């Protein structure tokens, strides 16, 4: 279909604004470091500077919207299961209770620009929920992402 709507650029635009506390228009290594440092990790500035210059053509030292967009929009694979499997579950199970509640999945859903219905909501979670307990456990999630059948 290849729809692609403002909802895509908006999501990225919102995140970008987050990185640029001083909404200057372009993220700087320093600002980027501050955000990364406050991300529960502190990578070496070496790879950070090299990584930034790697994508940034004119390697001006700052990532422009066009660069940020393509940067992420382009890179979208995995290379790390425990990362995607955990990162996703972490988002779904906001409260991190070990189970995905309809309400939690409801937001993570519409929050993406989708108006579901009572019927869809039921089958939405009820389908993944093998125990029909109106909730999905991490175990069920992994299996659902694996076999899927």
């Amino acid at each position: 279909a290849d729809i692609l709507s403002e909802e895509q650029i908006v999501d990225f635009k919102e995140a970008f604004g987050l990185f640029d506390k001083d909404g200057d228009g372009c993220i700087t290594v320093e600002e980027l470091a501050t955000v990364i440092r406050s991300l529960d990790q502190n990578p070496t500035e070496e790879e950070l500077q090299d990584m930034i210059s790697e994508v940034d053509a004119d390697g001006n030292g700052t990532i422009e919207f066009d660069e940020f967009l393509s940067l992420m929009a382009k890179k979208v694979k995995d290379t790390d299961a425990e990362e995607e499997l955990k990162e996703a579950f972490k988002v779904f199970d906001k409260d991190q209770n070990g189970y995905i509640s309809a309400s939690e999945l409801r937001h993570v859903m519409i929050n993406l620009g989708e108006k579901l219905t009572d019927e869809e909501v039921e089958q939405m979670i009820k389908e993944a929920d093998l125990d029909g307990d109106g909730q999905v456990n991490y175990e069920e999630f992994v299996k659902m992402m694996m076999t899927v059948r």
């Binding site: 290379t79 988002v91 993570v108 869809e120």
Partner: peptide, 25 residues
């Protein structure tokens, strides 16, 4: 409903509010 389920995960990957790419590096 397996489609929407994957869509939610796929969309989340695109959104990456944590920056899987940058966060990883």
């Amino acid at each position: 409903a397996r489609q929407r389920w994957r869509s939610s995960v796929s969309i989340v990957k695109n959104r990456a509010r944590r920056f899987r790419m940058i966060s990883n590096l």
